[PDB]
Symmetry: D2
Subunit: 256 residues, 4 copies
């Protein structure tokens, strides 16, 4: 008798057992969900990782920059879950920014690199919704992973810019998803350890988080973020869409 | 299994069966919560409303402007739930602004005495209730208040909107205090509920629609925050408004 | 040849020559404005202070909790600036919270009577002053209030933060009313301005809060100096921000736009 | 004795005399500024209508060579030994696939990427090129329209503005090292130069009429001067402690729900 009993949910973005999506998938299965997983590039390695999840689930290839993968996705999912069945949830846990746009001077990042990062990190949220909405049930939920980009910070640079774009994309996706009786929301997480001046500033930034968070923040524990995503995939936030839920220990609500 | 199974939760704010608190109480009981209810002024009237709930629940008097009521509250709750038990949740569903501060009356014509009463009941009392109840709350617990988005001005709601702006600020400070107990504090910002142009704009703006006759989605959202499923959220606002606030038109 | 040449502007909130309002008044006068000043309670002291401004200006008594002061204000201003003349600007630089609601006292230990007084003076009075003065303001005019960013909680500032959240909301409603007169209403959110007394623990918290500002501000923040804030207020009083109302302008070195 | 007296200011984004940049340039010259203009497309014919002569430099923000040579070309135009006190970014672009009647989901990424390059990334590109020739106390200003909420039609241009707002906050960090401010002006809709059809035309007219209705001081979409003046305020010394920020020149519309 789980929070997600009988729900069919697609989860993208597992690459390691530290991946936020791995914990999302773990909690979702513990709560009764039937999953379809998608992975990028390193499929044999990803299969080895997903073997560590509590239940078996099909793994499909999805490169969000690959138009052919996106064109075939719905059919591939339907084959996996069975004709006449549809998805109740979709989790987007995908991000990438080349090193030039992260860690290197903000100004030295070439647009080619920034563009690739925006494609994967922001545009693909719309891509995946476009592909999947036709196979989603009413009452369904699309959830994307965010971090709060309302203020600039050292190091994350163009990735922050990409999250700013993602939040805007989410609001437009919500308009489209509404036509299908589907919600679209983002979870804005605090820092999670999922793997020199960049490192020093990130350190201060991460140390700041636990001190600002009124309930604390454990950057080694993805479970609170995973549980938040499962809340959004459930029937218990039925009037929330186009929105951002902060799973960050309350840090963004506190100056110090 | 219920979402709130075994949880002891205090719910304020029931005055009618259209009250948002009534629907919160109903859904919470359906999900296995054991409730303590608080009401203001018309306690016999409120008792008859609470008879409509699926399960029996003790009713305690609480006028949030009454310091003696606040002083005795934890002790009266402990009597209601049993010595050695604590609360897992507190729901603040309390608000009031005199007619001089809402409606047809010009914004400028509300006397400060009326505004101050409104702010006392609608904003400061979120802090008062947390002060009274945190000493009898369990770690992992949750305080939830009812809000509406006050980030932009609108016709009519005038000083009540100002009171909600205050309440949002108050919630952020309550989160700091509640955190010391391992307790979360959050507000649910609801769309309009019948408990007109402004109101019908809502369903138009909301990507998933908005039914102002239906409090259940708001009640479910409150229960989500009372549950263990949003453990990293505090000092925050969850919008149960059909997404209306994310859309311009 | 000043930014505010010919403008008649009322400036409230001077108590010392470190008051933000003192610097607003100074800059405004340097820029050709003709001022009327309002002061609370210690008018003799305030007269000695306003003797240090670049020009002589009339001083009117205004306790914003005194309804009779508010009822008579427009009349008294009109006497000060001449029959047939109206104001082009109004500066609200008034705030107050008792020590029970701001400082070392725990957030939960502020009684409502104290919080209510603070909200009266710090937030409600922005509406009060707008109500009293809009009938004697020219089209194109400007009402500016002082704010600090209350969107996140912080140590010490406690109920004054709550009062500022209320003020920001009040400002948006004042903008609706002021618009009828062709008048703008805006707030300037300033960084902290110096205008062991709280002990070492709270003293340390506040110093870290203050120093964090200068570190976050991309252009730095000088907490000794109200001039940049005074200039920002004068920008809002001028004709150069003519399509901005109900709004907040941050004069904080950009601190609020940066996380670390 | 003007607001920008003696200031040397680069203004990009003039294509017609209804361009917001044309109005910014006009007001800036009226206020005593010495301009250098940049354009990319007959533009000299348009810039000839400004009240004073200004050198006009080619700058395609997608062209890396134009960016790499920009500072040197500006220095030659303003004279060795002189630096810029201001820079205005008034540049935006989104293909019709990403903005207008085309469904949100039907914009290919190549089109969206081009739009984000020109509309968002180029704010950083220009700052990079020009900061080394800016005076302390200088000001960089870019044009925005409030993207905090989704709206019909504007679609991926809204996304590009959301990205621009984030870029501005990062440019502020870099610019501060030079004692330079970086801010955006978020304008309400301006009637620059039934093309979209009956249905989407009516949606847009509702979107525009609601703006004047929400604005407590009203909103005249035919008049860019209030926006031009706001830009000049930011270029002036009168907002010396504002950076990484957004100033709304929208009649107050964004502060009101109805
Ligand atoms: N770790 C954090 O601190 C943190 C905080 C907030 C938000 N997030 C967000 O959570 C999400 C997951 O990050 P994570 O921390 O688990 O890192 P991760 O590296 O485990 O996951 C990122 C995933 O993106 C996938 N990906 C990259 N390019 C792709 C492509 N072209 N097609 C399909 N998939 C692609 C990767 O394969 C990987 O599985 C990201 O959106 C990230 O920005 C992370
Ligand atoms: N109805 C809506 O459209 C709507 C939308 C968003 C938020 N809210 C909020 O939800 C909450 C509940 O409102 P509702 O719409 O259910 O209306 P309601 O009238 O049913 O509830 C208001 C409650 O506040 C209580 N109250 C008033 N003064 C009190 C005092 N001194 N001490 C203790 N309790 C007192 C009343 O007795 C009543 O039970 C309020 O905060 C309201 O602002 C309502
Ligand atoms: N100092 C800062 O760091 C800072 C930062 C941001 C905003 N502000 C705001 O700027 C404004 C001015 O504060 P300040 O720092 O110049 O302090 P201040 O003490 O110099 O000025 C506050 C003024 O409020 C007046 N006042 C108090 N009660 C009053 C009443 N009943 N009627 C009329 N006037 C009354 C006082 O007499 C005083 O002149 C306040 O709103 C304050 O919150 C200050
Ligand atoms: N309603 C409005 O018109 C409105 C409202 C708010 C903000 N804005 C913003 O104001 C700015 C100016 O827009 P406008 O309405 O004056 O339109 P406009 O078409 O006159 O100006 C757009 C400019 O961008 C320039 N441009 C396009 N691609 C370029 C490239 N590769 N390199 C260099 N320049 C390039 C064009 O030449 C043109 O001068 C834009 O950023 C726009 O988004 C416009
Ligand atoms: C060069 C590189 O690995 N860049 C990354 N960018 C992101 C962004 C989000 C999550 C993981 C990653 S890994
Ligand atoms: C005069 C009056 O009934 N005022 C109210 N104010 C509120 C505020 C919130 C909920 C119910 C109410 S009833
Ligand atoms: C007890 C006390 O002096 N409180 C204050 N509160 C404020 C608030 C704003 C400006 C000055 C002050 S002095
Ligand atoms: C005309 C067109 O296809 N695209 C444009 N996009 C923008 C965006 C901003 C300003 C002008 C324009 S013209």
């Amino acid at each position: 008798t789980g929070l997600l009993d009988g729900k069919r949910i697609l989860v993208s973005g597992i690459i390691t057992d530290s991946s936020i999506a791995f914990h999302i998938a773990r909690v979702a299965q513990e709560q009764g969900a039937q999953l379809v997983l998608t992975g990028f590039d390193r499929l044999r390695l990803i299969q080895r990782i997903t073997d560590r999840l509590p239940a078996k689930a099909p793994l499909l290839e999805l490169d969000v920059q690959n138009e052919e993968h996106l064109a075939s996705l719905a059919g591939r999912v339907t084959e996996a879950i069975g004709a006449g069945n549809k998805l109740d949830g979709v989790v987007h846990s995908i991000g990438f920014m080349p090193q030039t746009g992260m860690g290197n001077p903000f100004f030295d990042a070439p647009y080619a690199d920034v563009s690739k990062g925006i494609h994967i990190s922001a545009y693909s949220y719309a891509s995946m919704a476009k592909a999947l909405l036709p196979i989603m049930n009413p009452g369904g939920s699309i959830v994307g992973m965010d971090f709060d980009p309302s203020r600039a910070m050292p190091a994350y640079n163009w990735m922050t810019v990409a999250k700013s774009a993602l939040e805007s994309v989410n609001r437009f996706v919500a308009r489209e998803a509404g036509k299908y009786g589907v919600r679209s929301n983002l979870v804005a997480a605090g820092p999670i350890r999922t793997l020199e001046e960049a490192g020093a500033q990130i350190q201060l930034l991460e140390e700041g988080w636990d001190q600002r968070a009124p309930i604390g923040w454990n950057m080694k524990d993805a479970t609170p973020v995973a549980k938040t995503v499962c809340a959004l995939l459930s029937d218990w936030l039925p009037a929330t869409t186009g929105d951002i839920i902060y799973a960050d220990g309350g840090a963004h609500t506190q100056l110090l």
